[PDB]
Amino acid sequence: SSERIRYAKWFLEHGFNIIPIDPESKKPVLKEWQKYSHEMPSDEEKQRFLKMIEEGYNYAIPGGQKGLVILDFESKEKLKAWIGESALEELCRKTLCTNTVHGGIHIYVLSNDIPPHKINPLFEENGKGIIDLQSYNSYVLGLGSCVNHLHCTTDKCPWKEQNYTTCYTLYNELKEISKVDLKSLLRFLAEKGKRLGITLSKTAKEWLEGEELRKELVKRDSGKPVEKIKEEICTKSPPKLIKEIICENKTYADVNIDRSRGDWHVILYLMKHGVTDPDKILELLPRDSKAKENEKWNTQKYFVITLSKAWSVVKKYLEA
Ligand SMILES: [Zn+2]
Protein backbone atom coordinates (compact mmCIF):
# COMPACT_ATOMS: atom_id res chain seq x y z
CA SER A 1 0.00 0.00 0.00
CA SER A 2 2.17 2.94 1.20
CA GLU A 3 5.39 1.27 -0.22
CA ARG A 4 3.76 0.57 -3.62
CA ILE A 5 3.02 4.34 -4.09
CA ARG A 6 6.26 5.49 -2.43
CA TYR A 7 8.39 3.52 -4.89
CA ALA A 8 6.31 4.07 -8.07
CA LYS A 9 6.73 7.78 -7.33
CA TRP A 10 10.49 7.29 -6.94
CA PHE A 11 10.78 5.55 -10.32
CA LEU A 12 8.73 8.24 -12.14
CA GLU A 13 10.74 10.94 -10.48
CA HIS A 14 13.95 9.32 -11.74
CA GLY A 15 12.74 9.47 -15.31
CA PHE A 16 11.55 5.82 -15.62
CA ASN A 17 8.31 4.80 -17.29
CA ILE A 18 6.09 2.50 -15.24
CA ILE A 19 3.14 0.51 -16.43
CA PRO A 20 0.03 -0.15 -14.30
CA ILE A 21 -0.65 -3.84 -13.64
CA ASP A 22 -4.27 -4.91 -13.05
CA PRO A 23 -4.18 -6.72 -9.66
CA GLU A 24 -7.29 -8.73 -10.70
CA SER A 25 -5.91 -9.98 -14.05
CA LYS A 26 -2.20 -9.74 -13.06
CA LYS A 27 -1.50 -8.35 -16.56
CA PRO A 28 -0.86 -4.88 -17.89
CA VAL A 29 -3.96 -2.63 -18.12
CA LEU A 30 -2.67 -1.14 -21.44
CA LYS A 31 -2.80 -2.74 -24.85
CA GLU A 32 0.56 -1.70 -26.25
CA TRP A 33 2.55 -1.78 -23.06
CA GLN A 34 5.71 -2.82 -24.96
CA LYS A 35 6.05 0.74 -26.29
CA TYR A 36 6.92 1.97 -22.79
CA SER A 37 10.17 -0.04 -23.16
CA HIS A 38 11.36 2.65 -25.52
CA GLU A 39 9.16 5.82 -25.69
CA MET A 40 9.68 9.00 -23.64
CA PRO A 41 7.73 9.64 -20.42
CA SER A 42 4.87 12.10 -20.93
CA ASP A 43 4.23 14.16 -17.80
CA GLU A 44 0.47 13.71 -18.05
CA GLU A 45 0.91 9.99 -18.41
CA LYS A 46 3.29 9.90 -15.44
CA GLN A 47 0.68 11.73 -13.39
CA ARG A 48 -2.16 9.39 -14.49
CA PHE A 49 -0.21 6.20 -13.83
CA LEU A 50 0.82 7.40 -10.33
CA LYS A 51 -2.88 7.97 -9.53
CA MET A 52 -3.81 4.49 -10.78
CA ILE A 53 -1.24 3.00 -8.41
CA GLU A 54 -2.56 5.15 -5.51
CA GLU A 55 -6.00 3.72 -6.39
CA GLY A 56 -4.66 0.21 -5.88
CA TYR A 57 -3.12 -0.97 -9.18
CA ASN A 58 0.23 -2.72 -9.05
CA TYR A 59 2.96 -1.45 -11.42
CA ALA A 60 5.84 -2.77 -13.49
CA ILE A 61 9.08 -1.37 -14.82
CA PRO A 62 9.70 -2.21 -18.51
CA GLY A 63 13.29 -3.05 -19.57
CA GLY A 64 15.16 -1.27 -22.41
CA GLN A 65 14.17 2.27 -21.59
CA LYS A 66 17.18 4.47 -20.71
CA GLY A 67 19.56 1.54 -21.10
CA LEU A 68 17.77 -0.48 -18.33
CA VAL A 69 17.97 -4.23 -17.96
CA ILE A 70 16.80 -6.12 -14.89
CA LEU A 71 18.62 -9.34 -14.11
CA ASP A 72 15.82 -11.45 -12.64
CA PHE A 73 17.33 -14.31 -10.63
CA GLU A 74 14.93 -17.07 -9.59
CA SER A 75 16.69 -17.68 -6.22
CA LYS A 76 18.49 -15.24 -3.94
CA GLU A 77 20.11 -18.22 -2.21
CA LYS A 78 21.40 -19.46 -5.54
CA LEU A 79 22.86 -16.04 -6.44
CA LYS A 80 24.58 -15.78 -3.07
CA ALA A 81 26.27 -19.20 -3.57
CA TRP A 82 27.13 -18.42 -7.22
CA ILE A 83 28.84 -15.05 -6.75
CA GLY A 84 29.46 -15.02 -2.99
CA GLU A 85 28.14 -12.65 -0.33
CA SER A 86 30.90 -10.08 -0.90
CA ALA A 87 30.26 -9.64 -4.64
CA LEU A 88 26.49 -9.61 -3.96
CA GLU A 89 26.90 -6.84 -1.36
CA GLU A 90 29.03 -4.83 -3.76
CA LEU A 91 26.31 -5.17 -6.36
CA CYS A 92 23.57 -4.19 -3.85
CA ARG A 93 25.71 -1.26 -2.82
CA LYS A 94 26.27 -0.08 -6.37
CA THR A 95 22.68 -0.27 -7.66
CA LEU A 96 19.05 -1.14 -6.89
CA CYS A 97 18.42 -4.77 -5.91
CA THR A 98 15.04 -6.03 -4.76
CA ASN A 99 13.58 -9.26 -3.28
CA THR A 100 10.96 -10.86 -5.49
CA VAL A 101 7.76 -12.53 -4.26
CA HIS A 102 8.91 -16.10 -4.82
CA GLY A 103 12.36 -15.69 -3.20
CA GLY A 104 14.43 -14.37 -6.12
CA ILE A 105 16.32 -11.11 -6.66
CA HIS A 106 16.11 -8.37 -9.24
CA ILE A 107 19.29 -6.42 -10.06
CA TYR A 108 18.51 -3.28 -12.06
CA VAL A 109 21.30 -1.75 -14.09
CA LEU A 110 21.81 0.67 -16.95
CA SER A 111 24.16 -0.06 -19.75
CA ASN A 112 25.24 1.67 -22.98
CA ASP A 113 25.02 -1.73 -24.66
CA ILE A 114 21.94 -3.90 -23.99
CA PRO A 115 20.14 -6.49 -26.02
CA PRO A 116 17.19 -5.43 -28.22
CA HIS A 117 14.87 -7.89 -26.50
CA LYS A 118 14.67 -9.88 -23.22
CA ILE A 119 16.84 -12.94 -22.92
CA ASN A 120 14.90 -15.66 -21.16
CA PRO A 121 16.86 -17.55 -19.85
CA LEU A 122 20.22 -15.73 -19.53
CA PHE A 123 21.99 -18.53 -17.56
CA GLU A 124 21.08 -22.17 -17.17
CA GLU A 125 21.93 -24.77 -14.52
CA ASN A 126 21.22 -28.49 -15.01
CA GLY A 127 19.48 -27.52 -18.28
CA LYS A 128 17.10 -25.10 -16.62
CA GLY A 129 16.89 -21.32 -16.68
CA ILE A 130 17.75 -19.68 -13.39
CA ILE A 131 17.89 -15.98 -14.35
CA ASP A 132 16.16 -14.01 -17.15
CA LEU A 133 17.47 -10.74 -18.55
CA GLN A 134 14.53 -8.32 -18.80
CA SER A 135 15.19 -5.82 -21.58
CA TYR A 136 12.91 -4.36 -24.27
CA ASN A 137 9.44 -5.87 -24.50
CA SER A 138 9.50 -7.20 -21.00
CA TYR A 139 9.08 -5.90 -17.50
CA VAL A 140 9.42 -6.72 -13.85
CA LEU A 141 6.89 -6.12 -11.14
CA GLY A 142 7.71 -3.03 -9.15
CA LEU A 143 8.85 -2.48 -5.57
CA GLY A 144 5.90 -2.40 -3.26
CA SER A 145 3.57 -4.51 -5.42
CA CYS A 146 2.32 -7.65 -3.76
CA VAL A 147 0.88 -10.98 -4.83
CA ASN A 148 -1.52 -13.38 -3.10
CA HIS A 149 -0.13 -16.85 -3.85
CA LEU A 150 -3.68 -18.23 -3.59
CA HIS A 151 -3.97 -17.05 -7.17
CA CYS A 152 -0.62 -18.28 -8.53
CA THR A 153 -0.70 -21.06 -11.14
CA THR A 154 3.00 -21.55 -12.10
CA ASP A 155 4.72 -24.26 -10.14
CA LYS A 156 7.53 -21.75 -9.52
CA CYS A 157 5.25 -20.60 -6.69
CA PRO A 158 6.21 -22.35 -3.48
CA TRP A 159 2.85 -21.44 -1.91
CA LYS A 160 0.47 -22.06 -4.80
CA GLU A 161 -3.15 -21.90 -3.60
CA GLN A 162 -2.26 -20.91 0.00
CA ASN A 163 -3.74 -17.64 1.21
CA TYR A 164 -0.36 -16.04 1.63
CA THR A 165 0.79 -12.67 0.37
CA THR A 166 4.35 -11.53 -0.33
CA CYS A 167 5.75 -8.43 -1.99
CA TYR A 168 8.66 -7.01 -4.04
CA THR A 169 10.80 -5.34 -1.38
CA LEU A 170 14.20 -3.66 -0.85
CA TYR A 171 17.04 -6.10 -0.57
CA ASN A 172 18.75 -3.45 1.52
CA GLU A 173 18.12 0.18 0.85
CA LEU A 174 16.79 2.21 -2.04
CA LYS A 175 19.49 3.48 -4.33
CA GLU A 176 19.60 4.89 -7.78
CA ILE A 177 19.83 2.50 -10.65
CA SER A 178 23.44 2.74 -11.66
CA LYS A 179 25.31 2.30 -14.93
CA VAL A 180 27.47 -0.78 -15.49
CA ASP A 181 29.29 -2.45 -18.34
CA LEU A 182 26.73 -5.21 -18.80
CA LYS A 183 28.86 -7.47 -20.97
CA SER A 184 31.48 -7.27 -18.26
CA LEU A 185 28.99 -8.12 -15.54
CA LEU A 186 27.78 -11.06 -17.63
CA ARG A 187 31.35 -12.30 -18.21
CA PHE A 188 31.91 -12.09 -14.44
CA LEU A 189 28.77 -14.08 -13.79
CA ALA A 190 29.90 -16.67 -16.34
CA GLU A 191 33.36 -16.92 -14.76
CA LYS A 192 31.90 -17.42 -11.28
CA GLY A 193 29.27 -19.85 -12.63
CA LYS A 194 31.77 -22.23 -14.27
CA ARG A 195 32.52 -24.11 -11.02
CA LEU A 196 28.77 -24.59 -10.39
CA GLY A 197 27.77 -25.57 -13.93
CA ILE A 198 25.85 -22.26 -14.35
CA THR A 199 26.36 -21.36 -18.00
CA LEU A 200 25.19 -18.74 -20.53
CA SER A 201 22.23 -19.89 -22.63
CA LYS A 202 22.79 -20.00 -26.41
CA THR A 203 20.99 -16.69 -26.94
CA ALA A 204 22.94 -14.99 -24.15
CA LYS A 205 26.28 -16.20 -25.50
CA GLU A 206 25.54 -14.99 -28.98
CA TRP A 207 24.51 -11.56 -27.82
CA LEU A 208 27.49 -11.36 -25.48
CA GLU A 209 30.39 -12.98 -27.20
CA GLY A 210 29.88 -12.68 -30.90
CA GLU A 211 26.40 -2.48 -45.02
CA GLU A 212 24.33 -5.54 -45.70
CA LEU A 213 22.20 -3.50 -43.27
CA ARG A 214 21.70 -0.33 -45.33
CA LYS A 215 20.51 -2.57 -48.16
CA GLU A 216 18.05 -4.21 -45.79
CA LEU A 217 16.99 -0.79 -44.42
CA VAL A 218 16.49 0.52 -47.94
CA LYS A 219 14.73 -2.70 -48.97
CA ARG A 220 12.29 -2.50 -46.02
CA ASP A 221 11.54 1.22 -46.51
CA SER A 222 7.90 2.06 -47.32
CA GLY A 223 9.15 3.92 -49.39
CA LYS A 224 7.16 7.08 -49.88
CA PRO A 225 8.34 10.60 -50.72
CA VAL A 226 9.58 12.61 -47.74
CA GLU A 227 6.72 15.10 -48.16
CA LYS A 228 4.11 12.34 -48.02
CA ILE A 229 5.82 10.89 -44.91
CA LYS A 230 5.66 14.27 -43.18
CA GLU A 231 2.00 14.58 -44.14
CA GLU A 232 1.13 11.07 -42.97
CA ILE A 233 2.94 11.50 -39.62
CA CYS A 234 1.61 14.96 -38.98
CA THR A 235 -1.97 13.76 -39.40
CA LYS A 236 -1.46 10.75 -37.03
CA SER A 237 -1.45 12.33 -33.64
CA PRO A 238 2.32 11.97 -32.99
CA PRO A 239 3.97 12.29 -29.60
CA LYS A 240 5.19 15.66 -28.48
CA LEU A 241 8.78 15.34 -29.66
CA ILE A 242 7.84 13.94 -33.02
CA LYS A 243 5.28 16.71 -33.58
CA GLU A 244 7.91 19.33 -32.74
CA ILE A 245 10.66 17.98 -34.97
CA ILE A 246 8.77 16.44 -37.87
CA CYS A 247 5.81 18.76 -38.01
CA GLU A 248 6.96 22.01 -36.42
CA ASN A 249 10.47 22.12 -37.82
CA LYS A 250 12.04 22.77 -34.44
CA THR A 251 15.65 21.88 -33.49
CA TYR A 252 16.63 19.81 -30.43
CA ALA A 253 18.04 23.05 -28.94
CA ASP A 254 14.67 24.79 -29.53
CA VAL A 255 12.82 22.09 -27.63
CA ASN A 256 15.65 21.79 -25.14
CA ILE A 257 16.30 18.06 -25.49
CA ASP A 258 19.62 16.25 -25.52
CA ARG A 259 20.77 15.66 -29.14
CA SER A 260 21.37 11.94 -28.65
CA ARG A 261 18.06 11.30 -26.91
CA GLY A 262 16.24 13.34 -29.60
CA ASP A 263 17.79 11.34 -32.44
CA TRP A 264 17.09 8.02 -30.73
CA HIS A 265 13.38 8.69 -30.21
CA VAL A 266 12.83 10.32 -33.57
CA ILE A 267 14.53 7.40 -35.34
CA LEU A 268 12.51 4.72 -33.51
CA TYR A 269 9.23 6.42 -34.43
CA LEU A 270 10.18 6.83 -38.11
CA MET A 271 11.30 3.17 -38.38
CA LYS A 272 8.07 2.08 -36.70
CA HIS A 273 6.30 4.24 -39.33
CA GLY A 274 8.06 2.27 -42.06
CA VAL A 275 10.64 4.93 -42.89
CA THR A 276 13.86 2.93 -42.75
CA ASP A 277 15.89 4.46 -45.63
CA PRO A 278 18.81 6.14 -43.88
CA ASP A 279 18.83 9.15 -46.19
CA LYS A 280 15.16 9.83 -45.64
CA ILE A 281 15.80 9.56 -41.87
CA LEU A 282 18.76 11.91 -42.14
CA GLU A 283 16.65 14.47 -44.02
CA LEU A 284 13.93 14.44 -41.32
CA LEU A 285 16.39 14.90 -38.41
CA PRO A 286 16.97 18.54 -37.37
CA ARG A 287 20.20 20.43 -38.11
CA ASP A 288 21.61 20.03 -34.60
CA SER A 289 21.31 16.24 -34.88
CA LYS A 290 24.33 14.39 -33.48
CA ALA A 291 24.25 12.65 -36.94
CA LYS A 292 24.92 15.99 -38.66
CA GLU A 293 26.64 18.22 -36.12
CA ASN A 294 29.84 16.40 -35.49
CA GLU A 295 33.30 16.03 -36.91
CA LYS A 296 32.79 13.89 -39.98
CA TRP A 297 34.71 10.78 -38.76
CA ASN A 298 32.40 10.64 -35.76
CA THR A 299 29.30 11.54 -37.70
CA GLN A 300 29.21 8.26 -39.58
CA LYS A 301 30.07 5.97 -36.67
CA TYR A 302 27.31 7.62 -34.65
CA PHE A 303 24.68 7.42 -37.42
CA VAL A 304 25.43 3.79 -38.31
CA ILE A 305 25.47 2.67 -34.70
CA THR A 306 22.24 4.49 -33.91
CA LEU A 307 20.48 3.21 -37.01
CA SER A 308 21.71 -0.32 -36.32
CA LYS A 309 20.51 -0.31 -32.69
CA ALA A 310 17.22 1.44 -33.48
CA TRP A 311 16.38 -1.06 -36.21
CA SER A 312 17.15 -4.10 -34.04
CA VAL A 313 14.91 -2.60 -31.35
CA VAL A 314 12.08 -1.89 -33.85
CA LYS A 315 12.34 -5.38 -35.41
CA LYS A 316 12.03 -7.13 -32.04
CA TYR A 317 9.24 -4.82 -30.93
CA LEU A 318 7.17 -5.48 -34.03
CA GLU A 319 7.86 -9.17 -33.66
CA ALA A 320 6.54 -8.80 -30.06
ZN1 LIG B 1 3.02 -17.32 -5.87
XYZ file of N, CA, C and O in Angstrom, residues 185-306:
488
model
N 29.667 -7.434 -16.631
C 28.988 -8.124 -15.536
C 28.656 -9.567 -15.948
O 28.814 -10.511 -15.180
N 28.154 -9.729 -17.156
C 27.784 -11.063 -17.634
C 28.966 -12.008 -17.730
O 28.841 -13.215 -17.462
N 30.114 -11.481 -18.159
C 31.345 -12.296 -18.213
C 31.808 -12.681 -16.786
O 32.280 -13.803 -16.526
N 31.614 -11.787 -15.834
C 31.912 -12.088 -14.441
C 30.998 -13.164 -13.911
O 31.456 -14.137 -13.286
N 29.687 -13.012 -14.135
C 28.771 -14.083 -13.791
C 29.160 -15.411 -14.451
O 29.047 -16.437 -13.844
N 29.558 -15.409 -15.715
C 29.901 -16.672 -16.343
C 31.136 -17.279 -15.673
O 31.223 -18.492 -15.489
N 32.122 -16.438 -15.343
C 33.357 -16.919 -14.757
C 33.074 -17.573 -13.418
O 33.516 -18.697 -13.150
N 32.307 -16.888 -12.588
C 31.895 -17.420 -11.284
C 31.000 -18.650 -11.413
O 31.044 -19.531 -10.568
N 30.170 -18.712 -12.452
C 29.267 -19.854 -12.632
C 29.904 -21.151 -13.106
O 29.348 -22.209 -12.919
N 31.099 -21.076 -13.684
C 31.767 -22.230 -14.266
C 31.870 -23.360 -13.259
O 31.528 -24.477 -13.567
N 32.337 -23.056 -12.048
C 32.522 -24.106 -11.018
C 31.221 -24.708 -10.537
O 31.235 -25.764 -9.912
N 30.088 -24.021 -10.759
C 28.773 -24.592 -10.387
C 27.931 -25.148 -11.539
O 26.745 -25.481 -11.351
N 28.512 -25.236 -12.726
C 27.765 -25.575 -13.931
C 26.665 -24.596 -14.340
O 25.743 -24.989 -15.045
N 26.789 -23.335 -13.952
C 25.848 -22.262 -14.348
C 26.463 -21.614 -15.581
O 27.582 -21.056 -15.521
N 25.786 -21.770 -16.720
C 26.358 -21.362 -18.004
C 25.415 -20.472 -18.834
O 24.182 -20.581 -18.736
N 25.999 -19.636 -19.700
C 25.195 -18.735 -20.527
C 24.316 -19.557 -21.451
O 24.780 -20.555 -21.991
N 23.051 -19.174 -21.659
C 22.225 -19.889 -22.628
C 22.756 -19.552 -24.033
O 23.516 -18.584 -24.201
N 22.316 -20.294 -25.050
C 22.788 -20.004 -26.406
C 22.531 -18.553 -26.790
O 23.416 -17.891 -27.306
N 21.325 -18.049 -26.539
C 20.988 -16.687 -26.939
C 21.852 -15.667 -26.216
O 22.267 -14.696 -26.804
N 22.135 -15.898 -24.935
C 22.941 -14.987 -24.150
C 24.366 -14.923 -24.743
O 24.916 -13.858 -24.990
N 24.935 -16.090 -24.976
C 26.278 -16.199 -25.497
C 26.428 -15.509 -26.855
O 27.443 -14.848 -27.149
N 25.416 -15.643 -27.697
C 25.536 -14.993 -28.983
C 25.372 -13.488 -28.900
O 26.123 -12.772 -29.529
N 24.471 -12.985 -28.062
C 24.509 -11.564 -27.820
C 25.843 -11.116 -27.249
O 26.453 -10.153 -27.736
N 26.303 -11.801 -26.213
C 27.487 -11.362 -25.479
C 28.766 -11.464 -26.300
O 29.463 -10.481 -26.534
N 29.065 -12.674 -26.724
C 30.390 -12.985 -27.202
C 30.282 -13.397 -28.629
O 30.456 -14.589 -28.948
N 30.014 -12.417 -29.482
C 29.884 -12.684 -30.895
C 28.961 -11.662 -31.499
O 29.368 -10.890 -32.371
N 27.208 -1.713 -45.994
C 26.395 -2.485 -45.017
C 25.391 -3.373 -45.736
O 24.613 -2.915 -46.574
N 25.423 -4.649 -45.396
C 24.333 -5.543 -45.705
C 23.077 -4.978 -45.014
O 21.945 -5.323 -45.354
N 23.293 -4.107 -44.038
C 22.201 -3.499 -43.269
C 21.486 -2.401 -44.084
O 20.277 -2.498 -44.373
N 22.236 -1.367 -44.459
C 21.702 -0.329 -45.329
C 20.799 -0.940 -46.400
O 19.690 -0.476 -46.633
N 21.280 -1.982 -47.068
C 20.515 -2.566 -48.161
C 19.208 -3.108 -47.614
O 18.171 -3.013 -48.272
N 19.263 -3.676 -46.407
C 18.054 -4.210 -45.786
C 17.150 -3.078 -45.294
O 15.929 -3.210 -45.329
N 17.751 -1.973 -44.845
C 16.991 -0.787 -44.424
C 16.309 -0.136 -45.621
O 15.135 0.248 -45.575
N 17.062 0.007 -46.704
C 16.487 0.522 -47.943
C 15.369 -0.392 -48.445
O 14.272 0.052 -48.742
N 15.662 -1.680 -48.488
C 14.733 -2.702 -48.970
C 13.429 -2.755 -48.182
O 12.389 -3.037 -48.763
N 13.474 -2.452 -46.878
C 12.292 -2.500 -46.020
C 11.544 -1.158 -45.904
O 10.489 -1.072 -45.259
N 12.124 -0.117 -46.497
C 11.545 1.216 -46.509
C 10.196 1.192 -47.266
O 9.973 0.330 -48.123
N 9.331 2.167 -46.993
C 7.898 2.062 -47.322
C 7.401 2.284 -48.763
O 6.265 1.882 -49.088
N 8.121 2.965 -49.639
C 9.153 3.924 -49.393
C 8.600 5.150 -50.127
O 8.779 5.363 -51.337
N 7.867 5.942 -49.371
C 7.160 7.084 -49.877
C 8.111 8.272 -50.038
O 9.248 8.255 -49.541
N 7.632 9.320 -50.707
C 8.338 10.597 -50.717
C 8.389 11.205 -49.322
O 7.514 10.963 -48.499
N 9.405 12.015 -49.069
C 9.575 12.609 -47.742
C 8.397 13.515 -47.371
O 7.979 13.587 -46.223
N 7.848 14.188 -48.367
C 6.722 15.102 -48.157
C 5.457 14.353 -47.736
O 4.683 14.846 -46.925
N 5.244 13.181 -48.329
C 4.107 12.339 -48.020
C 4.248 11.816 -46.586
O 3.284 11.776 -45.826
N 5.478 11.415 -46.241
C 5.821 10.891 -44.913
C 5.512 11.949 -43.863
O 4.880 11.658 -42.853
N 5.948 13.180 -44.110
C 5.664 14.265 -43.183
C 4.165 14.448 -43.052
O 3.647 14.596 -41.948
N 3.467 14.452 -44.186
C 2.002 14.576 -44.140
C 1.330 13.450 -43.383
O 0.453 13.709 -42.563
N 1.733 12.206 -43.654
C 1.135 11.072 -42.973
C 1.365 11.172 -41.465
O 0.457 10.904 -40.681
N 2.611 11.452 -41.051
C 2.937 11.501 -39.620
C 2.207 12.635 -38.941
O 1.690 12.488 -37.834
N 2.156 13.775 -39.611
C 1.611 14.963 -38.982
C 0.083 14.931 -38.861
O -0.498 15.660 -38.065
N -0.540 14.011 -39.558
C -1.969 13.762 -39.403
C -2.276 12.493 -38.578
O -3.376 12.029 -38.615
N -1.303 11.977 -37.819
C -1.458 10.753 -37.028
C -1.314 10.932 -35.564
O -0.982 10.008 -34.902
N -1.533 12.111 -35.054
C -1.449 12.329 -33.636
C -0.137 11.915 -32.990
O -0.158 11.255 -32.012
N 1.004 12.337 -33.518
C 2.316 11.966 -32.992
C 2.568 12.502 -31.602
O 1.952 13.465 -31.202
N 3.483 11.873 -30.880
C 3.974 12.288 -29.597
C 4.623 13.649 -29.700
O 5.022 14.080 -30.803
N 4.778 14.285 -28.547
C 5.191 15.664 -28.482
C 6.467 15.938 -29.236
O 6.552 16.916 -29.979
N 7.483 15.104 -29.033
C 8.779 15.344 -29.658
C 8.664 15.195 -31.154
O 9.214 15.974 -31.890
N 7.962 14.176 -31.600
C 7.842 13.944 -33.020
C 7.108 15.143 -33.649
O 7.522 15.663 -34.697
N 6.012 15.578 -33.030
C 5.281 16.714 -33.578
C 6.249 17.885 -33.759
O 6.321 18.487 -34.822
N 7.006 18.185 -32.714
C 7.910 19.333 -32.736
C 8.934 19.272 -33.863
O 9.159 20.260 -34.555
N 9.562 18.110 -34.035
C 10.657 17.980 -34.966
C 10.169 17.685 -36.367
O 10.701 18.243 -37.349
N 9.212 16.789 -36.515
C 8.775 16.443 -37.869
C 7.797 17.463 -38.420
O 7.778 17.772 -39.624
N 6.945 17.967 -37.547
C 5.810 18.762 -38.015
C 6.013 20.236 -37.758
O 5.450 21.050 -38.465
N 6.795 20.588 -36.747
C 6.955 22.007 -36.416
C 8.341 22.550 -36.762
O 8.645 23.725 -36.552
N 9.182 21.687 -37.310
C 10.472 22.123 -37.823
C 11.369 22.732 -36.762
O 12.236 23.520 -37.065
N 11.178 22.322 -35.516
C 12.037 22.767 -34.435
C 13.344 21.944 -34.332
O 13.403 20.822 -34.823
N 14.371 22.542 -33.721
C 15.655 21.875 -33.489
C 15.581 21.248 -32.116
O 14.659 21.550 -31.366
N 16.530 20.365 -31.786
C 16.625 19.808 -30.432
C 16.897 20.939 -29.425
O 16.328 20.956 -28.334
N 17.736 21.903 -29.808
C 18.039 23.051 -28.943
C 16.804 23.910 -28.677
O 16.669 24.463 -27.600
N 15.936 24.056 -29.686
C 14.666 24.790 -29.531
C 13.838 24.093 -28.475
O 13.340 24.736 -27.557
N 13.673 22.781 -28.591
C 12.820 22.085 -27.628
C 13.613 21.600 -26.425
O 13.102 20.845 -25.605
N 14.854 22.065 -26.315
C 15.654 21.789 -25.137
C 15.675 20.296 -24.784
O 15.328 19.894 -23.670
N 16.077 19.473 -25.745
C 16.303 18.056 -25.492
C 17.719 17.680 -25.920
O 18.278 18.228 -26.881
N 18.311 16.765 -25.175
C 19.618 16.250 -25.521
C 19.631 15.711 -26.969
O 18.749 14.954 -27.366
N 20.629 16.108 -27.750
C 20.774 15.656 -29.137
C 20.577 14.168 -29.311
O 19.776 13.733 -30.124
N 21.351 13.394 -28.555
C 21.374 11.939 -28.655
C 20.018 11.314 -28.384
O 19.628 10.383 -29.066
N 19.373 11.765 -27.313
C 18.056 11.300 -26.911
C 16.996 11.668 -27.973
O 16.127 10.862 -28.316
N 17.097 12.885 -28.507
C 16.235 13.341 -29.597
C 16.340 12.447 -30.825
O 15.304 11.983 -31.365
N 17.578 12.166 -31.256
C 17.787 11.341 -32.438
C 17.205 9.939 -32.228
O 16.594 9.353 -33.116
N 17.440 9.402 -31.036
C 17.091 8.022 -30.735
C 15.574 7.927 -30.871
O 15.051 7.063 -31.558
N 14.860 8.813 -30.219
C 13.382 8.691 -30.211
C 12.774 9.003 -31.562
O 11.798 8.348 -32.025
N 13.336 10.002 -32.227
C 12.831 10.320 -33.572
C 13.039 9.154 -34.535
O 12.129 8.765 -35.313
N 14.227 8.556 -34.477
C 14.531 7.402 -35.338
C 13.652 6.171 -35.106
O 13.162 5.570 -36.051
N 13.485 5.767 -33.853
C 12.513 4.715 -33.507
C 11.115 4.906 -34.100
O 10.538 4.006 -34.697
N 10.552 6.097 -33.899
C 9.229 6.423 -34.425
C 9.156 6.264 -35.961
O 8.252 5.626 -36.502
N 10.099 6.888 -36.660
C 10.184 6.825 -38.113
C 10.267 5.365 -38.589
O 9.580 4.975 -39.529
N 11.112 4.562 -37.942
C 11.296 3.172 -38.381
C 10.018 2.399 -38.104
O 9.587 1.596 -38.922
N 9.379 2.700 -36.982
C 8.071 2.083 -36.696
C 7.047 2.524 -37.754
O 6.162 1.759 -38.127
N 7.180 3.754 -38.252
C 6.298 4.244 -39.331
C 6.607 3.632 -40.676
O 5.891 3.876 -41.649
N 7.665 2.852 -40.766
C 8.063 2.266 -42.062
C 9.075 3.066 -42.862
O 9.323 2.791 -44.056
N 9.630 4.095 -42.240
C 10.638 4.930 -42.892
C 11.994 4.462 -42.398
O 12.461 4.885 -41.337
N 12.592 3.544 -43.150
C 13.856 2.930 -42.752
C 15.074 3.337 -43.597
O 16.230 3.045 -43.221
N 14.821 4.038 -44.718
C 15.885 4.456 -45.632
C 16.729 5.491 -44.912
O 16.218 6.537 -44.519
N 18.033 5.212 -44.720
C 18.814 6.138 -43.884
C 18.831 7.599 -44.383
O 18.856 8.545 -43.583
N 18.791 7.808 -45.693
C 18.833 9.154 -46.190
C 17.542 9.886 -45.937
O 17.554 11.118 -45.679
N 16.419 9.174 -46.011
C 15.158 9.829 -45.643
C 15.176 10.241 -44.157
O 14.764 11.340 -43.775
N 15.654 9.314 -43.328
C 15.796 9.561 -41.873
C 16.668 10.772 -41.627
O 16.285 11.692 -40.913
N 17.842 10.774 -42.245
C 18.763 11.907 -42.142
C 18.092 13.236 -42.525
O 18.235 14.248 -41.843
N 17.369 13.252 -43.639
C 16.650 14.469 -44.023
C 15.576 14.967 -43.025
O 15.293 16.159 -42.966
N 14.984 14.064 -42.240
C 13.935 14.440 -41.322
C 14.474 14.860 -39.931
O 13.788 15.524 -39.170
N 15.697 14.454 -39.613
C 16.394 14.904 -38.414
C 16.712 16.403 -38.509
O 16.956 16.917 -39.590
N 16.711 17.116 -37.374
C 16.966 18.541 -37.374
C 18.452 18.861 -37.599
O 19.288 17.947 -37.600
N 18.797 20.137 -37.796
C 20.197 20.431 -38.107
C 21.182 20.219 -36.972
O 22.376 20.009 -37.226
N 20.716 20.285 -35.729
C 21.608 20.025 -34.600
C 21.636 18.547 -34.213
O 22.080 18.193 -33.127
N 21.197 17.678 -35.120
C 21.309 16.240 -34.884
C 22.774 15.801 -34.645
O 23.684 16.259 -35.324
N 22.991 14.904 -33.690
C 24.332 14.388 -33.477
C 24.846 13.664 -34.735
O 26.051 13.456 -34.867
N 23.925 13.295 -35.649
C 24.251 12.652 -36.944
C 24.636 13.635 -38.028
O 24.919 13.239 -39.165
N 24.658 14.916 -37.681
C 24.918 15.988 -38.662
C 25.933 16.993 -38.134
O 26.689 17.609 -38.888
N 25.889 17.181 -36.819
C 26.643 18.220 -36.125
C 27.708 17.485 -35.368
O 27.507 17.074 -34.224
N 28.834 17.287 -36.025
C 29.836 16.396 -35.493
C 30.999 16.571 -36.430
O 30.817 17.077 -37.544
N 32.190 16.188 -35.986
C 33.304 16.026 -36.907
C 32.956 14.822 -37.767
O 32.338 13.864 -37.268
N 33.346 14.851 -39.039
C 32.794 13.893 -39.980
C 33.156 12.433 -39.666
O 32.341 11.528 -39.930
N 34.335 12.178 -39.077
C 34.710 10.776 -38.756
C 33.788 10.194 -37.694
O 33.533 8.987 -37.661
N 33.280 11.053 -36.827
C 32.396 10.640 -35.757
C 30.965 10.494 -36.271
O 30.205 9.632 -35.835
N 30.635 11.368 -37.203
C 29.298 11.535 -37.703
C 28.757 10.201 -38.198
O 27.607 9.834 -37.922
N 29.609 9.476 -38.922
C 29.211 8.260 -39.575
C 29.180 7.075 -38.641
O 28.252 6.277 -38.718
N 30.151 6.963 -37.744
C 30.069 5.968 -36.672
C 28.761 6.121 -35.877
O 28.052 5.163 -35.642
N 28.464 7.345 -35.461
C 27.308 7.617 -34.655
C 26.026 7.205 -35.408
O 25.197 6.462 -34.880
N 25.878 7.685 -36.640
C 24.680 7.418 -37.417
C 24.446 5.928 -37.683
O 23.352 5.401 -37.419
N 25.474 5.231 -38.142
C 25.425 3.794 -38.311
C 25.040 3.037 -37.048
O 24.181 2.137 -37.077
N 25.695 3.377 -35.937
C 25.475 2.670 -34.697
C 24.038 2.891 -34.228
O 23.365 1.976 -33.782
N 23.601 4.134 -34.284
C 22.241 4.493 -33.910
C 21.199 3.808 -34.791
O 20.200 3.261 -34.295
